[PDB]
Symmetry: C2
Subunit: 51 residues, 2 copies
Amino acid sequence: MKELIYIEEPSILFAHGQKCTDPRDGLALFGPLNQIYGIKSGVVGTQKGLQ
Amino acid sequence: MKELIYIEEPSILFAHGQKCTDPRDGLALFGPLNQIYGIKSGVVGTQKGLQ
């Protein structure tokens, strides 16, 4: 029987210096690192695409 | 003894459709038209320049 060693899952920083594993949880809990003030979206498409 | 024609001051629009003659006062009372969410400022210079 061969030994399967374990590599612990690393944690990724988030807002306030906190660390979590899943982005989908670290973002929901604390939020992203740096702050932008907003996204001015530009859309290049048809009218139906814009809708 | 010559006629001097008067030209009425033109109004510059501002936020919420309000028009004022002075750009500064119109900005203060009403504000600009489009709402950019912020200014991600970029600085290119020395340390004292950034300070």
